Amino acid sequence: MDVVSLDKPFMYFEEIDNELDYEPESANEVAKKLPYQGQLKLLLGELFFLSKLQRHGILDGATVVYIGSAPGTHIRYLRDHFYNLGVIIKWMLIDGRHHDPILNGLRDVTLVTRFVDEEYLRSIKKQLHPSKIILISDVRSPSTADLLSNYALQNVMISILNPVASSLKWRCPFPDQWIKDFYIPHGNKMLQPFAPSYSAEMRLLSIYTGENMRLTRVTKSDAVNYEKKMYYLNKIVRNKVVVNFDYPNQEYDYFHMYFMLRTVYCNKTFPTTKAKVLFLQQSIFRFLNIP
Amino acid sequence: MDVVSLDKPFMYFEEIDNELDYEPESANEVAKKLPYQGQLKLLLGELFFLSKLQRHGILDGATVVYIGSAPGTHIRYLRDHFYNLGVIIKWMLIDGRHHDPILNGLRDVTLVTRFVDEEYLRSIKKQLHPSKIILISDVRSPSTADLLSNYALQNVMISILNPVASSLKWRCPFPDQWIKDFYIPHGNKMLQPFAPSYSAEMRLLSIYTGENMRLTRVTKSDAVNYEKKMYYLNKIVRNKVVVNFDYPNQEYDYFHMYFMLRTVYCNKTFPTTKAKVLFLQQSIFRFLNIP
Ligand SMILES: C[n+]1cn([C@@H]2O[C@H](COP(=O)(O)OP(=O)(O)O)[C@@H](O)[C@H]2O)c2nc(N)[nH]c(=O)c21
Ligand SMILES: C[n+]1cn([C@@H]2O[C@H](COP(=O)(O)OP(=O)(O)O)[C@@H](O)[C@H]2O)c2nc(N)[nH]c(=O)c21
Ligand SMILES: Nc1ncnc2c1ncn2[C@@H]1O[C@H](CSCC[C@H](N)C(=O)O)[C@@H](O)[C@H]1O
Ligand SMILES: Nc1ncnc2c1ncn2[C@@H]1O[C@H](CSCC[C@H](N)C(=O)O)[C@@H](O)[C@H]1O
């Protein structure tokens, strides 16, 4: 068995302290071990992001515009969580694909079947006005050309919507498929527990202060680094059994999930953080029908 | 006579401490009082900007890419000034129009007759590599639609060229011709002595640290402010005779020119700042054939 003792898990990209030469043979390995693992991945990341905004007092009264939301099964859980906590939020879920029927019939959630273009963003901005917007993007076209186009759209989302915070899908193009250097918004590179086994995807979390928008250039050298740090995380770290983690499941992803869940607010008062987390996890797994 | 005593002149937009309702009748007033006033305007601004970079030690060894450079008569003066100071610089002047023949025959200056598009910027970037680039832009198409397009090109100039510093033409669209909010790079809004009488144009000066690029949103409310602050500067300030300014000419623009010129480096040693400035001004006016 692959045992180790860890203090904390890598929460952000920059914390990764090692790297590995990417082995293309990893692409043939089992990408997922849990049913609905993709909804779990998104649920934890967005719960983490949104709880932060609550902590900063910028969630209540906001309209969450989620682009690339369908099917969105896990979004029903997020909505119920903040709804039950007393936070007042409107959700606007936009995707060309259809949403899970569990999202219908809620006055606080608007479902839209539209593929967003810069022009449509303008109309929704004019229509949301004057509400504060929180953007969450998970749009999907992939080639490096598809990616750049997605990233280019995400940047236009921020410029037109002008949100107070944003969570953006972020996976750097692979060095061997480089096309050109580009810019992404500045934010924390949140790592994702339960991401596919060898995924190099993370989420870019940003909070917009002032009227400024800071970007950051991404080059091929950055692409090489992303590939090597993520490959090391996936191949090595995520395959560790954190034995000094007394918890029903000690696998790295549960250890990592624990640190995100410990930041979540609950109505119920618990005697320990461990009890709150077990509760949140049981709750999340039951909702998603994960054994 | 319109007399006043001033400590310093307004060097940057933010320093303007008052505003006036724009009077459209000002558009019919004499825009210029000196011959070649436009070359003088550009010369002082770019001398100011470039001397700053020298002060920060980022000029020597750079390639100055000037887009929208023609005719560029005043650029010959700039080139001679730094050339004679020992600073090593390559100049690349690009415009679809032809340059002043005085710019020919200098091994350190390349003249290009091309209307730049994003694609061309890419080729010149690949070709300048690996030199450090200093961008100066004075491109001209104007409607608010022409402006936005110009500004959009200037931002692509910075993203592709990735310069260490930049000077950009900046005039906010008028509030009554607003089209949409947009972003410009963050920089100092340098005011321009000898700008046309009622011009709302300034230059955006930026130095790029790290791999970050910070932008700033410009709205119609900003457009109203720009109009009112600039109108106050033009109608009131620029029409003042600074009597506590002992100098051959006491008009505001000369008082303002004095503060830019006092920052310029010379080979010759002077007993007073006043002597250096008079020298630089005499020199500049003689070069431009201004009486
Ligand atoms: C993690 N990774 C994946 N690939 C390629 O990406 C393909 C799809 O796997 P994926 O990377 O999970 O796709 P996604 O990012 O769209 O979700 C694989 O079949 C590999 O060919 C990769 N190719 C390179 N060069 N480097 C990597 O780090 C890498
Ligand atoms: C300074 N100013 C100029 N204009 C208009 O701009 C026209 C051209 O004058 P300009 O503003 O000097 O042109 P430019 O910025 O392209 O160099 C004038 O005939 C006016 O109609 C202006 N129009 C408005 N609404 N507000 C202003 O502050 C203003
Ligand atoms: N322009 C656009 N507008 C809306 N959604 C977009 C988009 N282009 C692609 N997408 C969507 O991006 C999605 C990526 S899959 C998203 C999964 C979703 N976030 C979840 O909660 O279940 C797809 O449903 C696709 O239709
Ligand atoms: N894409 C482009 N590439 C090059 N120059 C451009 C441009 N579009 C417009 N311009 C140029 O922008 C200039 C504006 S006038 C510039 C005056 C000049 N800076 C001086 O030193 O004399 C015009 O000469 C025009 O041809």
On whether any CB of chain B is under 8 Å from the CB of A159, the answer is: yes
* B258 Cα: distance to centroid of ligand 2 (angstroms): 27
* Chain B residues within an 8 Å CB radius of A212: 186, 214-217
B218 to chain A: closest CA residue? A211
CA distance B224 to B22: 10
Residue A132, SS3? coil
* Chain A residues within an 8 Å CB radius of B181: 162
CA distance B12 to B278: 23
Count the neighbouring beta carbons within 10 Å of the beta carbon of residue B129: 8
CA distance B138 to B45: 12
* Catalytic center residues of B: 169
* Chain A residues within an 8 Å CB radius of B211: 216-217, 219
User: Which residues, including other chains, have CB under 8 Å from residue B243's CB and lie 6 or more apart?
Assistant: B3, B4, B5, B250
Count the neighbouring beta carbons within 10 Å of the beta carbon of residue B133: 22
The structural domain count of chain B equals 1
* B36 Cα: distance to centroid of ligand 4 (angstroms): 17
Residues B96, B102, B104, B108, CA torsion sign? negative
Closest CA to B170 of B139, B194, B201: B201
Elucidation technique: X-ray
What's the DSSP call for residue A4? E
Give me the phi and psi of B10, to 5 degrees please: -80, 115
On whether any CB of chain A is under 8 Å from the CB of B225, the answer is: no
Alpha carbon B21 to its chain's center? 26
CA distance A259 to A208: 25
CATH of the domain at B224: 3.40.50.150
Query: Do the beta carbons of residue A140 and residue A101 sit within 8 Å?
Result: no
CA distance B91 to B68: 13
Instruction: Find out whether the beta carbon of A259 lies less than 6 Å from any atom of ligand 1.
Output: no
Residue A257, SS3? helix
Tokens encoding B60 = 């020597």
Range of the domain at A148: 1-291
What's the DSSP call for residue B131? S
Single-letter residue type at B138: D
Closest CA to A205 of A149, A153, A283, A135: A135
B162 to chain A: closest CA residue? A217
Give the dihedral of Cα atoms A183, A188, A190, A191; nearest 10 deg: 70
Ligand 1 atom closest to A177 (CA): 25
Tokens encoding A224 = 């090489």
Instruction: Find out whether the beta carbon of A29 lies less than 6 Å from any atom of ligand 1.
Output: no
Give the closest of A211, A212, A216 to B211, CB-based. Answer: A216
Query: Do the beta carbons of residue A167 and residue A204 sit within 8 Å?
Result: yes
Closest CA to B14 of B225, B234, B291: B225
Residue A118, SS3? helix
Q: Are A215 and B215 a contacting pair at CB < 8 A?
A: yes
* B227 Cα: distance to centroid of ligand 2 (angstroms): 9
On whether any CB of chain B is under 8 Å from the CB of A213, the answer is: yes
Give the closest of B213, B217, B219 to A215, CB-based. Answer: B213
Q: Report the first-to-last Cα separation within chain B, whole angstroms.
A: 23
On whether any CB of chain B is under 8 Å from the CB of A123, the answer is: no
Helix (H) or strand (E) holding A80: helix A73-83
Quickly list H helices, chain B.
37-55, 73-83, 118-128, 144-161, 220-235, 252-261, 273-288
CA distance B242 to A144: 60
A208 is annotated as contributing to ligand binding: no
CA distance A78 to A69: 12
**Which of these is catalytic: A52, A169, A240, A276?**
A169
* B149 Cα: distance to centroid of ligand 2 (angstroms): 18
Tokens encoding B287 = 């070069």
Q: Are A216 and B216 a contacting pair at CB < 8 A?
A: no
> Which ligand is closest to the CA of A120, given by its number?
3
Closest CA to B207 of B56, B66, B62: B56
On whether any CB of chain A is under 8 Å from the CB of B275, the answer is: no
Residues A262, A267, A270, A276, CA torsion sign? negative
Closest CA to A93 of A107, A75, A78: A75
